[PDB]
Symmetry: D2
Subunit: 442 residues, 4 copies
């Protein structure tokens, strides 16, 4: 937990010096740590995942210098916000900077000119097209666009998905609002400190790590299906009515199960492995629930159907699926390539090809600044998958939304559209008779 | 075994008389039998499988009136060549005609004009674009195209793949040559007789039926993978050095096992079902081996891998594959939709989605007409698969040739090309160390 | 005469060279050897190629006689025995003799339509491999029969370098006559036409009344030139058959409409453009009934006077007709000769707009007769692919005058071609309706 | 004087309507209201829109003074405070007064480029949403800065209906002068120009010498008319440089260009009497400061070139002299509306458009805005989308004469445009190399 002792590079201060030299980061900045970048961070960075969270603030009481100051303080409190991402010596790494001055990009618009249209212009015109996270310049930056009277302002926060996740992003907002409202905040832990905790929980002799033994056992016997080799990102949507969840059964479990029966039909298998997304926050850590970073992980989820004389109800799969999740809670946090390297005979660089992600997170957002201020949320976002298929479930109050995201070369529009409906129809089926033997709908 | 004993319609001699008035068949023809069209026959008809077998004849000794006579003689001999195909009362059926006068289409070319070029023009111009087998006009027809001296003549025989297969097509040529050479031929059984023999061979009760008992146990607890969502017929080729065959092993086994390993990686299955072509000539009747028609069958082939605690050599697989074939010999001749209806849960109209066909048949062809004459073979062919992928293998002297044929929407050129290279690669690996245990591919 | 117009020293050793490559029959003789006209090379360069098809249904039909008719008709029309070649880039006619005609014959399956067979041969090989300047004989016969020979198709293939509108019906009346052994008059070779054209030429050109006419005719004229420009397009617009003012011909009315279209677009009061003439005003004998391509494509100059002169449609009309009638005696000479002898223009200057009024037979016959009675219907297959030029064809049927524009899509796009056809249509009809109007027409 | 020429009964209720829609500032006055000229309306229908970009790199820069220079300049030039609209069918200028200029300002991130930002705004919203006839003031300023104000890009946006080649350098020199607080000799409106044109015109139109000159000038003429051509289509620019032409004694570079075209046209049209469009500066009116006032006084008028019959044996020199006087003859008459030329002096439809316009760029091709020491570099962004017409522009740089062709790809395909540029180019060179040649000449 002593700084610079997880660096894969030995003169870390000299990599700092060079970025400064190159005017890639501020030259008055200090290097307060240097750690490996995680697999899940790289997943995002490699997919150009980049957000611009925008807050349209209207009202007479807005304090502009305080807005500016809040940005600085937000960054002082969250070291993930002070982090540069770089590859050095074949190592993907993150650099924690301190003594970091935040400078807001400001725009005083012409009369009648819409603040948001200006942001959308900066965004489309240079902000994401020239995005180069691995060049080492901070992804996290602020923009202030104000009509002339300052009674209609848009504040934006740009950030790489390597720096937040669904559980902690709301904490970024409430922190910001609290800092602007002058509400004292409790001290917090860094994403770096999560990394060090991951590492302290590991044995130096891998064959003695309960985690990598659990995975070796969880996965012994198993074979993961591999798509036959495969140009734009495609998002495809299907809404259903929110399905009834028998006691003990998580909505996530439903989706993970409905996918497994889909994959059992289409593969010739009763032993399917596919990727799903875990929050990575089931560690014995202080602040684990609140710290800001990307502790999300993408891990193997094995669903196993019985020989077949066994007359499984839907419910039998439901409980089994859940167990194939909950079994791994204390082991869900390791690097995916580690699991492959230590618990399997699979190439460690083996990619997941399908990734199921249920969104049991906040689906609406809030930034309650005080005077009276109307504050409205919107975002811009990029996300470009490689060869994998993402299935996203969003549990709203009116609907579950099945979302498929994949490159068109991996899954064409009609394939995407069918996969949506197939997964939905099964979720529904599981909901309409959890009792039925698995002899359904296809 | 009486005629019409297998007709699924009740007035056969009136469907006949209907066709004659629509001028679909010769009015002076007689209807001798009427039977169900085989499932595999329909496979080809549905795919517009149509050949023009072309014989280029050069020499001074040619008897034109004898060539014409021989065409007629050949049709009197083989009833499948006297068969019209129609659909009626929801039923796919085949009408056997007699008192059928064979009329040749004849072309007297201009000096300098190439008869083959004329053939090609009629082929691409009308013959195959207007092809409508199920309308009920005879698929089998002859064309004679002559340079003015009758010393360069192309003879042409058209035919649906529903009326021949790989083993019996040479019989058609050899008989043709015998007839023209006035060489006496022995009595031959008809394709119909083949069908009457399948019925006699079966019991009226189905679980009772040992063939459907053997499949039920062959396919018990088996799951056959189903491709995701369903352009142009694309043919794709890769030829390798003819692999060496360990003692006991057929080339067909080497290919079938290479496909199973391939599908076991991609499906993450130890239990793979896929389609494959059998000659369907293991029934014991007289002339089974020599009768003209399509007795090809497409049937499930199941390959089962053990846990790798067993540690299979390649050889263990080869032997298992071969055995998963040889087991079904006495049962391989039944309708596929019957196998599904009677031995499985599976929907009976379940399509094979992959079909592996090893061409252990004649690959070169001869028509030794006598005077001296030069007689050269060539062909025109149509074939348009549906949603399935065919893998064909041709064991020539200088190369094993792997050939993939599928619609481009089912499998795109880049993929097809990879499939070809991959299967070839596994075949080749199987050949250079049959003893190796399962690793390394591909 | 023969061979006096041969642009090669050894004709017989070009014929032998061809016989030796199996381009023409080995038993054939070379009987004349002349230049192909400029008009002939126009059609050849555009791959202009026709299959004239006769559907014959009936009991009394004599296949053997049909075959002989083919041979004899070719016998009497030397253009039908002509093969085309280039030798020093300047295409020539080899007239053949001792020419055995061999019909291509098809006996169809029962049920097989004979026309579909012909059509398949046409698209499958006959035109796609056409190579007239290779030397093989363009004129060739096909006979496709249903098995009882009571329904046949006869097809005559031919290059447009071997026929024109006025003489094609002769080919049909001759065929029918030969078959019925009805007696026929004697007739002239197309080659006779060529010889006659030259006979009337002056041995030196600045003296030739023809090239003197053309010099005066085009004196002052500038012919407009398209700016730089891949499929042949045909575009049609039918209008009510126009009323013709007294003395004014239909063709004149079409050509005046165009002239006016052009003067407006060019902002010119003196337009020159191409138009087709029949080339059969030469006073030779049997001029109007021989068989070949006597067509010529020549300049038509239309000069509008200043606006103070106050011209009526009628004035434009008479002048237009006059600008045609004036050239009758001189319209038969090579265009490239008109240019180099009578003007300042490059000899190889192409005509870029060609107006052709079809004042010829538009429907045809083959009264084969038969010993019960033969029913013979006409139809045809045709290729024609313009180069950089635009054609305007008018077609005067009973119920419509069909304005036809043909031109490569790269030259005149579909929507322009539609506008051209419509505009020319409108001007015409507008002329018909009020011939006394002043040239203050609305139109565009 | 003000509100003369106003083609609407109630001008101030049109300024009212605009203000109560926040199209223009509520606190602004309607100082004048006039017709928009035909040439102005040409540029507007074609979306002609410029951003003039000054990159200032230096120590001494005064940001507050920059803002104010913006204000003063707009005060000085009434065309800069003009808004454009279409009422009663026809497009008109509203001149505004008591108009406060609001500069758009951007303080960039560290290491973020000012110009990349302007560019982003330009393509992101500035031109794609342009709507001049909607009434918003097309003239508007932008200042984008690096965080120490030692690096700034000022931009000026403007419609081509507000400037032309002779007066744009004035805009720049006036700005610098204001910035530097160098005093300035007063100037006239663009509005002054309009009021003058009406003053010098006669009221019985058949009595106006201008329209008698044009009637006589175009007497007997027919202008050729394009055929169609249609197919959307893209604006193409095509360039061909040639060696700067040696000029024959007494002949200008512009005559050289227009004679080449005439010769090109007479050949393709097969015509000895050709009429085509060409651009005049419109600054020959005798008026105070005609040469300095800021606006678009440009006009597009007929140039008629008449070749005699061959027996006359014209030389290239004859064509050059004739062509030049076909221009100098019209100098005093060049300032009237094209549509008025056609209505009053010909029998051609008044709304007849020119289909070919030649414009010789005998104006400044480089620019300046000179303010420790400030380094001030020029660049620009620009839109322009022609309709059915073809433009030919010639640009007389030191190393090359640039023949530029502009026309929608539907009117002239890339291939034709390239050939046009090469043909005209080649004719110019030929004329230059052998001006005594007879017009019966080779390539
Ligand atoms: C056979 C149709 C499958 C459609 C392709 C879906 C595109 C991406 O899917 C990724 C999931 O991959 C796991 C499934 O593996 C299938 C392997 O198929 C090989 C049989 O040829
Ligand atoms: C994968 C390329 C498509 C090849 C054509 C079909 C080949 C027939 O093999 C069937 C086995 O394929 C399994 C289907 O895979 C579906 C699972 O993935 C679909 C969505 O993730
Ligand atoms: C840069 C403008 C080009 C100059 C005008 C050229 C117009 C050519 O004169 C037309 C005479 O040509 C008649 C035949 O052209 C048919 C092509 O039509 C295509 C477009 O008009
Ligand atoms: C010549 C191709 C179009 C070039 C762009 C338009 C140039 C405008 O110049 C107009 C002068 O051309 C008028 C002549 O147009 C020819 C009309 O007749 C051709 C037959 O359609």
């Amino acid at each position: 937990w002593e700084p610079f002792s997880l660096s894969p590079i030995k003169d870390p201060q000299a990599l700092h010096a060079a970025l400064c030299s190159k005017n890639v980061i501020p030259v008055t900045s200090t290097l307060e740590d240097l750690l490996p970048a995680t697999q899940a961070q790289h997943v995002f960075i490699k997919r150009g995942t980049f957000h611009s969270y925008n807050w349209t603030i209207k009202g007479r009481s807005l304090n502009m210098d305080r807005l500016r100051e809040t940005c600085q303080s937000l960054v002082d409190r969250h070291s993930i916000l002070r982090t540069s991402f770089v590859e050095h010596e074949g190592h993907p790494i993150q650099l924690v900077l301190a003594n970091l001055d935040v400078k807001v990009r400001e725009v005083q618009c012409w009369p009648g000119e819409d603040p948001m249209e200006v942001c959308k212009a900066l965004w489309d015109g240079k902000d994401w097209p020239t995005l180069n996270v691995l060049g080492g310049s901070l992804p996290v930056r602020f923009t202030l666009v104000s009509c002339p009277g300052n009674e209609h302002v848009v504040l934006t926060i740009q950030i790489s998905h390597s720096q937040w996740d669904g559980v902690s992003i709301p904490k970024l907002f409430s922190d910001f609002a609290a800092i602007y409202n002058q509400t004292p905040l409790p001290p917090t832990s860094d994403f770096a400190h999560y990394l060090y905790h991951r590492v302290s929980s590991a044995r130096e002799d891998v064959q003695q790590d309960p985690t990598f033994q659990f995975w070796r056992h969880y996965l012994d016997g198993a074979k993961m299906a591999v798509p036959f080799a495969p140009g734009q990102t495609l998002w495809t949507f299907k809404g259903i009515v929110p399905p009834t969840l028998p006691s003990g059964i998580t909505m996530a479990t439903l989706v993970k199960a409905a996918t497994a029966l889909f994959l059992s039909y289409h593969l010739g298998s009763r032993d399917v492995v596919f990727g799903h997304t875990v929050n990575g926050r089931n560690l014995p850590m202080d602040n684990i629930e609140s710290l800001l970073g990307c502790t999300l992980n993408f891990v193997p989820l094995r669903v196993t159907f019985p020989e077949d004389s066994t007359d499984w109800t839907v419910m039998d799969l439901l409980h089994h699926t859940q167990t194939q999740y909950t079994r791994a809670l204390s082991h869900e946090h390791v690097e995916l390539r580690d699991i492959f390297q230590h618990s399997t005979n699979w190439p460690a660089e083996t990619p997941l090809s399908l990734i199921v992600q249920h969104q049991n997170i906040d689906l609406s957002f809030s930034l309650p600044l005080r005077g009276s201020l109307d504050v409205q949320y919107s975002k811009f976002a990029r996300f470009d998958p490689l060869d994998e298929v993402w299935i996203f479930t969003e549990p709203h109050a009116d609907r579950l939304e099945v979302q498929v995201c994949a490159n068109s070369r991996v899954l064409g529009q009609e394939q995407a559209t069918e996969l949506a409906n197939n997964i939905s129809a099964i979720i529904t089926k599981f909901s309409t008779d959890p009792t039925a033997r698995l002899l359904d709908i296809t």
